[model samples]
Target: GVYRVCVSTGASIYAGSKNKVELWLVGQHGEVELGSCLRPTRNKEEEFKVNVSKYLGSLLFVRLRKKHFLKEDAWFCNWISVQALGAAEDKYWFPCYRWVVGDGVQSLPVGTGCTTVGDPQGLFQKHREQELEERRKLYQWGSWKEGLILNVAGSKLTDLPVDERFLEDKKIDFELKNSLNILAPWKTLDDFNRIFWRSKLARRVRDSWQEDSLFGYQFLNGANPMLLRRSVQLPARLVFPPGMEELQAQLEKELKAGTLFEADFALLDNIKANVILYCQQYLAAPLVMLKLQPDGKLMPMVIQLHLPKIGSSPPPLFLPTDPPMVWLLAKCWVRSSDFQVHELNSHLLRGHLMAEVFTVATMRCLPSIHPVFKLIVPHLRYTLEINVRARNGLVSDFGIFDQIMSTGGGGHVQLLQQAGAFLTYRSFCPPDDLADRGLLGVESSFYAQDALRLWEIISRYVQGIMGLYYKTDEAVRDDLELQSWCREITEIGLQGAQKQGFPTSLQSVAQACHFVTMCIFTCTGQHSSIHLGQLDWFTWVPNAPCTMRLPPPTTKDATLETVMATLPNLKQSSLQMSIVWQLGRDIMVPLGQHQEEYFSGPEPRAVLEKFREELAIMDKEIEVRNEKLDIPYEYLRPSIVENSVAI
Candidate 1:
């Protein structure tokens, strides 16, 4: 019986070169030369017949020999395949795509096709089948190329219209005004008691039971003012991370440790544990707009809540209660809940003050000492130094808090000078020295808020990119409703790459994934510390000038352990797949038709794979350490829950 062999060449032809190519069949009985072609043109097909009766019980090799005018320029076959005449073609193999007359090249890819300078057929078959299965599954999952459609938001009436006839329409009424005596301190005992007990202010104080009727500027600061002033619908409710028992236990320990000494014990006494826990869940709520009551009294509401519970409902109005309690509630409410706003103006203002003092001391002592400090001070200024006049009438003034000193005292300057002296002399050793002195685990209070602010900035960028896909809040809800919020963002990224072209979209998707990873890492990883780990410690290495090149091992607390364990694995997941390396091949490799070279060489996927390997090692190390230390993984698990998506 005769077997048919086919050879096809690609578009590239030998340039002005004479070529003679011979094909032969080699079996147990020596070999037989089939035929030869002279100067075979490009994209040409050649067919040959081989008598396979003797080789049918054995194996045969189809070999090619070529003679060319020059050594470098030669003829090549684009593709070659062999089939037995009148036999099934299904069992045949498609050899490597390229076979050239050369010393260091092969017809098939290194690991693909038949067993020749590669894996055996079974192994190759397994891999090919696995890849085919993966592709089939991916294709079955549907392409992310679906276009993003936005629903037009329609305005709806908030409340039913009232009948004018029900209102008292008389314009001949006297002005209802308060007595001027209400403002003055009375001269007599009876006058004092009468005004204090019977006045409107007294009644308001009795009913609300909050500290100072007016919302003070001391607790107020700018919270993503850009997102606040817009005509946007507030989320009807907010999702809070679970594992509250664990979080509460952690916070309770913190309270006992004096970390929260300033926290209102009275507020904790007045409200339920659940309420305080709710407040803790949304440590930074959005920039709240004060509602002016019908009586023209201003009331600040806690619109940001963990779950839409009653106390969480109708916004927690500032009642005339304990000052410390009210302040504590406000402090925890906004920072945790708001997406764009991480830290409240109150804390950020304190951070700004702290940074300014640090800067002043740095300038006063060693001007060129800490590059990290100088780099960080400007960011602190940006967060601290907002146009307060533009954002409502309230300003974030450090002077409002008497606990903080406006002017650095001589002792304070001396302390900073001494600290600078050591820092300047033993720059890198400062952190280490402090660690020796029981001051190591402090984790730079100055940088913590700034790190959170950085994460918030990244979050806003991701939100903006996601904004292109979701025009209305309804569409956003729709995505979230199906629990495909992150998937939708990834789909939009894929669609964006297809529509806007790969290079730009690749960058966008990479950046989006980076920040999403950052958000997951920052919130779940480091909590208040915000130090992502030793991998991220390089940024602070400059700050520890006199230490070893690597920063000292950060002392791990309970919270820090939870943070470390929560570190994300961004390999092979949806987050990893969000960035399609193949899409960016053109820009990265740049050689168009030499696509095989690009795939064969070390590419971006290899880089990510290496990174993934490194991160996996670190994660395993942390996991082992946590297990040895008896740290529970429960704290980190809440972040991985089903309903944790926040805008």
Candidate 2:
């Protein structure tokens, strides 16, 4: 007998193996050696044939063993296909879609992520269950705080498992790409133009960052787009102060007409600001009021900086009509406060750390053969590595958050804790969130329009994938492994936070599909929307300064020099610029590309292709809409969104 074997390497640049690879066919007739030294090149395929005497009946496994050759011999094997040559064709496939460095046997089962029982149940089932038990041990979880979600068990990046560490190329990118230097504070504001002179967008932001249109639209398209909701009613403390009858009447009229909106950063109440370059800093938990105009523009009406903190004096309302310098300072203050919450709560906590919780829960609870596991594992790519690095380097003691921005030290933790109370399942569910925020029908919001479409596509795709494995609502409840996954991800991973509305039990197909959709959208679309703008919106410094050296103004007569001095100094700005550049670098796999061929069966494969087809259609629709807009929100574009929290 003869067997034709094809082994494919992954598409990454350095995915090739510098080791001797051997294979064996395992079945009822036991294991048969297929010889050795199948040199695999990156993004290439190697096909060969092996002669054997007996027939390998209904092959159960493909055991791949790698031998050490060179000093760095880790390999990223994509998948393997084996065909036993006979009068009639017979074939089997095994997915080895991961890195292999040590000389250990990788026992791969056939490529069918089936949740049902096998025909030859007791024979090789031991390997499957044994694999799951080992996975549980590998992906242990622990809490970083009492109420916060769980994290992968590790103190730093190096403490994580070998496979969970950053990809060799990604590690190098972090080391090399963000290597900018500035040892002292800026002597003049002209330095920002020089430091970020390379980016035309950054230059343009410097000229128009204070404009009403750019400033208002930022709530819909800026770094933290999820903020802003209809001003259903004036917030209690912000109800027209004591005077300003003309402003009060206009606001009430707009409020009645359904054209008002608000974004309150009251969450920053007690969060500590940093001391940068020997200057003490401060930030405001401001309440911003705005109007949706006739020509589809959002215009800021009022900014109330800290509501009577000492209760000794009424909080002053800073209007756009104030002196240009004074108003500009207030806007900068708001932007600076936004920068703190955006980076800490919106980006790191939700995108990286929360996703790590989900990633660990999935790895700990589900076996590789489970249907949901196969669907989501691709999105769990390199997340443990990212969060581990963050805890060690970015949010750690004397790190980025500690050294430059507000929410330094204990404030970062406090912000995340409070932000957790505000976070919910509905917050991430785009349509519901848009409706709740009263952004559902806002014609001018480019972020709203594009995000809704992306959410629909995500939900549609998830429904299709779940339909194949879960035939009916009853099957969803009956799936023991899936139920265990849901329970643990809620009680353990999310720490049973009811505010998140995370379903503890998936009893219906609709519930299951929607939950899955939320996971995919949060990791891909929501993450990209919040993350991609940091480099552009922040590199300009004045647009969204990471720190403010002076306290917010009580009087409305501050000077331009005052605003300039309040902005983050040169050293901090350069560091922020370099970090954003690094964070925005790679998306390893886009929304439609699921690095591995986890679903090799015909039915699931058809679902995946149809989903990709839908995404391609959306890609065109978003592009056409973007051509007519003043600014395009492409972060959620399927082609632009990362498949996971890769960066």
Candidate 3:
């Protein structure tokens, strides 16, 4: 009963076949063959002229093939290599092995595999540790980190025979031999140029630039330019004419009585002047997109003059009952494809398809001290009024309060004027007076500075009243009446100035006075509940969100129909005017300016250029990176067709 064996070997197992060995087994009556084994082959044969040799050892008893007797000759050595870890030798021994390198060419030299560390099997243990270390450092193979692995893979140089058991029929299953014991770390390199450009590229650039890696840019503050998507509206509402007229008449009678009230015309005049001034300062343009939340967050909107009465040489101008002071419009919200270009400045309002007013209202409700306060104050007002009305059953009362304030009547007339002045001024200037010399930053340009200066002048008078009320123990009536007189006189004052060659309008002067009044009141305590009047739920009108465009309720009603009938539109033959942002300008009069009508103004061009420059930088950088990586950006600007057209 004798036995025989057979064996096979592979060309590569670990790396190269510089060293070789043989193993055979013999028994009684047999020139027996035994299995041979070898090492694995590396993928970088082109870069590194090396390959491993593998042998498989196996036993098969000739007669025992019928009576099973099987044996496998196992491996004795753990590993054998010439390179040392972290040594110049190890660096180059496996050309693919290395550390964090961004971009650029660098050398990784070789070191001897000898170690001085304490161990009976010093060299063996050192190499073993190195192998384990490399295995542990392995990460995913496909990421950018693979670049580093590619560098090191070029350096592997061990040679051992592969196992024969993995072969099927005559073909070898190299996949088993090629399986990774561990992966390499994320790819990196010492090429500074590559890293620089990679990090510098921004997706926003246009076609002009080389797309180099340089710097970065982001919106300042909580400013999300996209918030321009939001809107503010004052839906049509019903006006209570009797209430407003009654209040107005009462106010006039009280003022005519002279000094009977503690507060007289002078104080009221002062407040009125400041209020008008504040409004004119900020609302000089037809519309302002008030940021309802954070400071820079504002929807695109306009407050342009309404269309004139039909069929007139020059159109008849008129005001709507809601007064139509502000409008939060969505330019392309309802349009499809290239909407901005089509409607860039078109104002031929066709009521059916082009215009459907929204229902939100934005108020310049606070002192400019807290931009956040702008959002907070409106919330507070809405919440307070809603809650109060719900509890008191005065749901339709907001308009009542609005009339009282606008008409200047009732027992607390002085309080009303003071409050109005305070609120107006707050909208224009900084809030807290305790901090820095000014509310705005030093970086603000000259124009912004001028606007702020104007705001401060108005705030002074508004705050002055606060001081008069709290510190000086002044009579509220006396203060309020004096303000009213001052306000009325300023309107007349400007008209007189206009006639006297100073050249300003009654409307303009009145607005200036009003704006100043509001600025002062907001920064100071003049309108505080502790001194003046309390905020009431009666200031809000419920269900009125539906009635602003209807006919008047009384002969004295200020309904849209009455207003339009009373005032005629005058711009019928003239082109529409729009105010938009300029580099350093505001309110450009297109046709009136020196250049061609549209080209004459900075409104459209300046803002558009800014957007273009930003996008150009980003697009160029991204394209440059694509050139280096030799790949295109995976995505293109999506077609609007892909977007839902259901809306």
Candidate 4:
């Protein structure tokens, strides 16, 4: 038996393990060395063979081993000389197409090869033999490669149509080369999502959902699977530790505890239980996204869900009579006899306020913070400062409810400051020292009509409750009677994230709503962004300074009625976006001068750099922790393109 081996790179000879080496390939083709070490034998007649004893399959090692064993012992078996070590990829000295060629029948990928039924030489041997030949025909044609190999998207080229194919031969200087051919590195959103979500820790969480009975029910019924699915889609920001499976285990434990809260309350407790459920789920969502880093490995990427506030436009003239009841009924009946959902109960309508809807999903954010606590803390600080000032401004003006309502409709949208305050007040924590608050806007287009409709439904629920019981009490007057609607709006806002497929904690959801509400208030209130200048920082929060120059609304606006008429005509750009404007109110600034922003110079470079620094630091810390935590390197996936490692 004779064997030969060679490796090739880009049109050049590099090195090979053996000119020819002894290999035992009995019952198979003559053994051939498949390593970088290659030596010329005095008599060029001997065939080269590869040693397969140590490694079952490894191209690099196989090639390296031939040269390694050319002259020595058992472990470093030098069956060949060291003279032929190290080859460039081209002519690097290994068997030609070593990666592509040489594999057993089963080594072929799925949708290829024969299907075996028991041992071929069995009771049904002859029948199986005939079946194999027939199947062989099917495999041969199906297995044929059409020169099209899986292309791991080297770089993203967007705006291209799906059917558009880039032919390598047509371009002026098209150089086609594929380094890892057999290694079809995952290159799709679905693929990354699957990998991250099914990571060892995540799979356990997915599998253990059923352990928490009520939590599971809330997840299935009260909870929205669509929302859950969306959360899972958040392109990973950080990798969970391998041994840090503890984090997952801890998460499941907390989640189970969180779920227990739901089970104990049977979702009868209100949106709080649901929030807890979503909190657990949302926390889990980002964990997976953070791990996957789907956007190109920008590890520790942040996921924010911004829900619009209530009432941007006037009430819909053509709402269903008892629209709130209709919505509630729809919600309750979702788990009826048809669904075999016998768990539906009075909890749907009971409790703090319809706003609890938003609260349940928005609050109880420990899990989200857990996955990236270091990142969340600074976010928390920035957030707390904004909310405190905003709340103060609200109190100084007409109070939270007053300011929220005095403007055309209740303000459900909140910014960082307001979001922090919401967590505090709602979670029963006192508003403490708040500082380092900065103002920035998350850009997203939201249809005001959707937010308006949500508020209307909530108002109906409030009106229904008021109809049932008179709330003449002062406390109710202060908190429930006037603010219940706002509360409900806020709930919808927080829950809105889930609805929109962003795994949102209560704070994030509240911020999302606040963003919308801010837009709504700006759009419908006596004021518009046109009235607010680029430096008015006192609109929402009293003392906080605006982060950037507020670019005025680039287009025209119409009255509520006119806006309503043109609703369908509105494009995505026309949708009201959440922006932080400099309020020209109670905020104090140096007299007689405009405030300089970080990026006031030519471009928004300074501002962007500051943000990048903060974010990168956040990313670095996450990577450090991930390394220590033993999170698999493959787990990190980024949702956005940035200069950062995915891991």
* lDDT winner, 3 or 4: 4
Q: Candidate 4, residues 1-647: lDDT per residue as tens digits? A: 11233322111122122332222222112223333333433213223333333322212212232223334211111121111223222111111111111111111111101112212333223333453343333211110011211111212222211111122222222210122222433332122122112124334333432222222222212211111111212122223323445444533453333211111111111111111111210000011111112221111111111111244321111111223322212111221111111101111111111122222212222111111111111111111222223334432234332222111011112111122222222111001100101000101101121223223322332233222222234322332212322332333333232332322222222332333232122111101111221122111111111110111111223233322221111111111111122122211211101121111122223333443454344335445654653222211111111111000
Please write out the lDDT profile of model 3 over residues 1-647, one tens digit for every residue: 12211112222233232222222222122323322222212322211112112221221111111111142222212121121222232111211111211122222111111212212343234333444344323311111112111101111111101221111222232111111311322122111112111011121221211111100000001101100111212211111123355433433443343201110012112221111112210000011112122222222212122122234332111112223211101110111101111111111101000110000001111111111111112111111212222222211223232221221112122333233222211222223221122214422112123233333433343333232222232322223322332332222311122222221221232343343343222222111111110011000111001111121121222333333222111110010010010100111111001121111123333433443343344335545654754223211111110010001
Every model's TM-score? 0.22, 0.91, 0.15, 0.17
Error of 2 at 266 (Å): 0.7
Query: 1 or 2: which has the higher TM-score?
Result: 2
Model 1 off-target regions past 4 Å?
12-18, 28-30, 37-40, 50-58, 70-72, 87-94, 103-647
TM-score: which candidate is best?
A: 2
Candidate structures ordered by lDDT, highest first: 2, 1, 4, 3
Native-to-model Cα distance after best TM-score fit, residue 110 in candidate 3, in Å: 99
**How many clashes show up in model 3?**
149
Q: Tell me the tens digit of each residue's lDDT in model 1 across 117-208.
A: 12233323443334334322321221111221111111111111111001121111200011444354433212222212222322432333
The 10-residue segment of model 2 with minimum total lDDT is 176-185
Q: How many angstroms is residue 561 displaced in model 1 relative to the true structure, after the best TM-score fit?
A: 36
